[PDB]
Design an enzyme around this catalytic site. Structure first.
Site, short mmCIF file in Angstrom:
data_model
loop_
_atom_site.label_atom_id
_atom_site.label_comp_id
_atom_site.label_asym_id
_atom_site.label_seq_id
_atom_site.Cartn_x
_atom_site.Cartn_y
_atom_site.Cartn_z
N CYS A 1 21.37 43.23 -3.02
CA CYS A 1 22.01 42.09 -2.32
C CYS A 1 21.49 40.76 -2.86
CB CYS A 1 21.83 42.20 -0.81
SG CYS A 1 20.10 42.26 -0.28
N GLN B 1 27.82 46.71 -4.03
CA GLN B 1 26.45 47.07 -4.49
C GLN B 1 26.27 48.58 -4.47
OE1 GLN B 1 24.49 44.43 -1.43
NE2 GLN B 1 23.14 46.16 -1.35
C1 LIG Z 1 16.43 39.24 0.43
S1 LIG Z 1 16.61 38.12 1.80
O1 LIG Z 1 17.82 37.40 1.50
O2 LIG Z 1 16.52 38.83 3.07
N1 LIG Z 1 15.45 37.02 1.80
C2 LIG Z 1 14.06 37.53 2.08
C3 LIG Z 1 13.25 36.37 2.62
N2 LIG Z 1 13.17 35.31 1.55
C4 LIG Z 1 12.24 34.36 1.79
C5 LIG Z 1 11.06 34.66 2.46
C6 LIG Z 1 10.15 33.67 2.74
C7 LIG Z 1 10.45 32.42 2.26
N3 LIG Z 1 9.76 31.30 2.48
N4 LIG Z 1 10.41 30.37 1.94
C8 LIG Z 1 11.54 30.82 1.38
N5 LIG Z 1 11.60 32.17 1.64
N6 LIG Z 1 12.49 33.04 1.34
C9 LIG Z 1 14.52 34.98 1.06
C10 LIG Z 1 15.36 36.15 0.66
#
Ligand SMILES: CS(=O)(=O)N1CCN(c2ccc3nncn3n2)CC1
Ligand SMILES: CS(=O)(=O)N1CCN(c2ccc3nncn3n2)CC1
Lengths: 220, 220
Positions: free
Chosen positions: B26, B20
């Site tokens: 990411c 990246q």
């Molecule tokens: C970029 S990451 O890989 O650090 N990440 C951030 C958090 N994300 C969420 C957040 C709340 C949520 N609630 N239900 C499903 N998610 N997914 C998923 C992707």
């Protein structure tokens, strides 16, 4: 064929509007409000559930930070894992981070599962609000116009899909040719229309209202 | 009964490790990695998909911020809504935010739906990796030990469930008594085990790896 309008308050499935105060616990209010409706649908009884229990207990293991924010889905998972949530009467709201004081003696609901709706799909959100019940959502409530909303259907050209505030969709309809979502907020009765805001519907996922919807269920 | 170990690289469903560079993409690498596996399962072709297409095109309306972060699930919804994603060869990675340059004449894959797994459930994640494919997850990579990781099973005492770094689970297994998740990172082949990190499994949702798992599927 879905109904042209829905209002879960007409079915007794929505509790009194709450006042979160200086504590960023909107996620907790959104989550309890969705589960309150399911509890009414299952048991016939309308009971306010403890947002404080989520603030104090659904904490870092759940990705939540109490008065500094959190997630409705992970609140649902805590209720599943914990095998319960206390009533609001038993575990009242203090607008502060406190030690976990959950006690099953005061349990007023359970949760068996939750569902996340697909991102941005306002037709799928309409189906869920018609067929399942009130739906937890996030909205972009950052804009000065939101705080000053009094009437009509809220449409803010500066709104984004960057959501920051958990709320509860309790219905939908059409007012004077403007389609809307009926949203229960947690800023007390002073806000909006006795604590509610009608937010623009089928206007390009306005304010991100259909970005991250979820709802819980209670099984037999 | 699930297999004791799985490695999707042995199934021909994992592309070369990407780099990246200075762009916080990411999420975009995680999402294209999950869909690359489903494309192989449907078509028999292993094709790198364009993470740059997601950075440039799955933007504000998807809650994403390009090099400043985003979500795998909303990336999947962009691919559904857009009716495609281009190949990496046609739309190569430049480690910067660009104007949307998607062209359907360079389409390499579609997406019909995606699934979010329940929060924090490592058994459900194991079932998905065994039966469905590689799974997009977030992990807490906010510790120097993650950057310094070279080999073996990663365990960080200070790790949290506050996830910030999108990665791809491509397998699972154990290293002489020590269960792990096999994770493909997007920090190039010099990172870790030639681009991979084995992260502690069944250690209390270590680093939030089972907090927010999702996987896409392709029609049929
Ligand atoms: C970029 S990451 O890989 O650090 N990440 C951030 C958090 N994300 C969420 C957040 C709340 C949520 N609630 N239900 C499903 N998610 N997914 C998923 C992707
Ligand atoms: C507190 S809030 O209402 O502003 N809001 C924050 C964003 N949340 C996410 C984020 C990614 C995600 N992916 N799946 C489900 N979500 N939910 C929902 C809760």
């Amino acid at each position: 064929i879905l109904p042209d309008s829905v209002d879960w308050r007409e079915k007794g499935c929505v509790t009194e509007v709450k006042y979160q105060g200086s504590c960023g616990a909107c996620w907790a209010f959104s989550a309890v409000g969705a589960l309150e409706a399911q509890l009414k649908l299952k048991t016939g009884k309308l009971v306010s559930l403890s947002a404080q229990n989520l603030v104090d207990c659904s904490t870092e293991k759940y990705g939540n930070k109490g008065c500094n924010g959190g997630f409705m889905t992970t609140a649902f998972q805590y209720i599943i894992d914990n095998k319960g949530i206390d009533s609001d009467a038993s575990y009242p709201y203090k607008a502060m981070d406190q030690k976990c004081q959950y006690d099953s003696k005061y349990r007023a609901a359970t949760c068996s599962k939750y569902t996340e709706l697909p991102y941005g799909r306002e037709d799928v959100l309409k189906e869920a609000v018609a067929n399942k019940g009130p739906v937890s959502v996030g909205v972009d409530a950052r804009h000065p116009s939101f705080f000053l909303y009094r009437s009509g259907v809220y449409y803010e050209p500066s709104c984004t899909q960057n959501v920051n505030h958990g709320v509860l969709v309790v219905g939908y309809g059409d007012l004077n040719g403007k389609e809307y979502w009926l949203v229960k907020n947690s800023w007390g009765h002073n806000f909006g229309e006795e604590g509610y805001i009608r937010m623009a519907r089928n206007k390009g996922n306005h304010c991100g209202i259909a970005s991250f919807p979820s709802y819980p269920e209670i099984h037999h």
